[PDB]
């Protein structure tokens, strides 16, 4: 009942169906790995089709305080209360759960993305105003008896997926389960601890790759990468695809790089791994990652006689975002209960006749250094 349960557009975030209030209120609502508020529209905004109306629900109560969240894309304000919310195509609990009721918002909202919300997902510590508003799946799993695990497949201008709560659906994924620590619980933060382009090793010491944490976010369209990591990569890559040149302005993602429909040179562009510290002293695994994730397709009907991508890896100030261009194609476990998420490919992953995603290890190091950053 749960699979297929996520729709999106590309570079838009993925949202599940959900209800406020009492009688329910329908919304659908972004699933964000990346935060820990849960915030629904609830005022008229140009965007929105639909926002929640606290007058028209019997069992909200009003909190009293105001809050504030600056993304890294987007920010809104609202009024804290609590209300019954619910997943029609989720386990089929509904729970009473802090909302953020959001009055005013910059950037925020997205023109035809079809969500009127966020459900943040990742732990208290980041939760505004602070970490005594409890997140959603912790009232999830303290009302309920949903086991303390959720599980995300996000697929491949409209796309889809699944979230599992409280379970693991192997239909989804094949081969091995591969997990990495979580390292603090706030952030779902995970540690890198070598990159590849092409095969070639990036050589950096690996606390650049943690420059100042790296995190796993749904939430997040783009890989994103401390500059230092982010210049070598686009190096490797502009020099593995050296056949063709193209504009400053695509590396920086101002620009699209097309193609007449059908024809992009897929063979051209490097794969990348990613290897993530595994459960065991200097033990890791990989996962890789091909240019049909890295190189979003932008849909417009106007462009059309073409195939047009944009370069969906940037640079950050604020450390490594594993964000849903990386994700797609892989089923991630995020296993609460055992601090660790897992990772797999999914039963839509991305490949050519060529070259396919992949989850492989175990990989050996004999550098004894901690590749955390802090
Ligand atoms: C899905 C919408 N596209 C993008 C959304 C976000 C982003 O900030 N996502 C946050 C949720 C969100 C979803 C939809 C619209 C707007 C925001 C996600 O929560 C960020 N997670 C890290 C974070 C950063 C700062 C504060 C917090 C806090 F904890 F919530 F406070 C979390 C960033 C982003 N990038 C920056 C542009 C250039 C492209 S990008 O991918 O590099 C593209
Ligand atoms: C904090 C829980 N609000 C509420 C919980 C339930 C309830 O009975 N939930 C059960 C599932 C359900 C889903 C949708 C409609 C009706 C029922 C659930 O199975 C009960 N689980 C045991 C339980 C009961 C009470 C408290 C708790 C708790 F875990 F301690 F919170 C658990 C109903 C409810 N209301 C519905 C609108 C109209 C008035 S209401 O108060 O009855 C508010």
């Given at each position: 009942?749960?699979?297929?349960?996520?729709?999106?557009?590309?570079?838009?975030?993925?949202?599940?169906?959900?209800?406020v209030?009492?009688?329910?209120?329908?919304?659908?609502?972004?699933?964000?790995?990346?935060?820990?508020?849960?915030a629904?529209?609830?005022?008229?905004?140009?965007?929105?089709?639909?926002?929640?109306?606290?007058?028209?629900?019997?069992t909200?109560?009003?909190?009293?305080?105001?809050?504030?969240?600056?993304?890294?894309?987007?920010?809104?304000?609202?009024?804290?209360?609590?209300?019954?919310?619910?997943?029609?195509h989720?386990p089929?609990?509904?729970?009473?759960?802090?909302i953020?009721?959001?009055?005013?918002?910059?950037?925020?909202?997205?023109?035809?993305?079809n969500?009127?919300?966020?459900?943040?997902?990742?732990?208290?510590?980041?939760?505004?105003?602070?970490?005594?508003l409890?997140?959603?799946?912790?009232?999830?799993?303290?009302?309920?008896?949903?086991?303390?695990?959720?599980?995300?497949?996000?697929?491949?201008?409209?796309?889809?997926?699944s979230?599992?709560?409280?379970?693991?659906?192997?239909?989804?994924?094949?081969?091995?389960?591969?997990?990495?620590?979580?390292?603090?619980?706030?952030?779902?933060?995970?540690?890198?601890?070598?990159?590849?382009?092409?095969?070639?090793?990036?050589?950096?010491?690996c606390?650049?790759?943690?420059?100042?944490?790296?995190?796993?976010?749904?939430?997040?369209?783009?890989?994103?990468?401390?500059?230092?990591?982010?210049?070598?990569?686009?190096?490797?890559?502009?020099?593995?695809?050296?056949?063709?040149?193209?504009?400053?302005?695509?590396?920086?993602?101002?620009?699209?790089?097309?193609?007449?429909?059908?024809?992009?040179?897929?063979?051209?562009?490097?794969?990348?791994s990613?290897?993530?510290?595994?459960?065991?002293?200097?033990?890791?695994?990989?996962?890789?990652?091909?240019?049909?994730?890295?190189?979003?397709?932008?849909?417009?009907?106007?462009?059309?006689?073409?195939?047009?991508?944009?370069?969906?890896?940037?640079?950050?100030?604020?450390?490594?975002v594993?964000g849903?261009?990386?994700?797609?194609?892989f089923?991630?476990?995020?296993?609460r209960?055992?601090?660790?998420?897992?990772?797999?490919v999914?039963?839509?992953?991305?490949?050519?006749?060529?070259?396919?995603?992949?989850?492989?290890?175990?990989?050996?190091?004999?550098?004894?250094?901690?590749?955390?950053?802090n």
């Amino acid at each position: 009942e749960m699979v297929d349960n996520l729709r999106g557009k590309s570079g838009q975030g993925y949202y599940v169906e959900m209800t406020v209030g009492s009688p329910p209120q329908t919304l659908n609502i972004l699933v964000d790995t990346g935060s820990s508020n849960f915030a629904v529209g609830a005022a008229p905004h140009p965007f929105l089709h639909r926002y929640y109306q606290r007058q028209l629900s019997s069992t909200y109560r009003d909190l009293r305080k105001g809050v504030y969240v600056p993304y890294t894309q987007g920010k809104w304000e609202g009024e804290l209360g609590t209300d019954l919310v619910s997943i029609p195509h989720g386990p089929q609990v509904t729970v009473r759960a802090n909302i953020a009721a959001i009055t005013e918002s910059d950037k925020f909202f997205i023109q035809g993305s079809n969500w009127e919300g966020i459900l943040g997902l990742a732990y208290a510590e980041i939760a505004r105003p602070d970490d005594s508003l409890e997140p959603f799946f912790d009232s999830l799993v303290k009302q309920t008896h949903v086991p303390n695990l959720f599980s995300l497949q996000l697929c491949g201008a409209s796309v889809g997926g699944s979230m599992i709560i409280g379970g693991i659906d192997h239909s989804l994924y094949t081969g091995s389960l591969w997990y990495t620590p979580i390292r603090r619980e706030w952030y779902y933060e995970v540690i890198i601890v070598r990159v590849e382009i092409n095969g070639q090793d990036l050589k950096m010491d690996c606390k650049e790759y943690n420059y100042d944490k790296s995190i796993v976010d749904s939430g997040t369209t783009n890989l994103r990468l401390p500059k230092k990591v982010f210049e070598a990569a686009v190096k490797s890559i502009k020099a593995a695809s050296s056949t063709e040149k193209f504009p400053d302005g695509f590396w920086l993602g101002e620009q699209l790089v097309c193609w007449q429909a059908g024809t992009t040179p897929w063979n051209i562009f490097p794969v990348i791994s990613l290897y993530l510290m595994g459960e065991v002293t200097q033990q890791s695994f990989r996962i890789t990652i091909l240019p049909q994730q890295y190189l979003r397709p932008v849909e417009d009907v106007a462009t059309s006689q073409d195939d047009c991508y944009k370069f969906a890896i940037s640079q950050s100030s604020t450390g490594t975002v594993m964000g849903a261009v990386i994700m797609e194609g892989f089923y991630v476990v995020f296993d609460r209960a055992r601090k660790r998420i897992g990772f797999a490919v999914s039963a839509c992953h991305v490949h050519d006749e060529f070259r396919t995603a992949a989850v492989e290890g175990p990989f050996v190091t004999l550098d004894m250094e901690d590749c955390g950053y802090n």
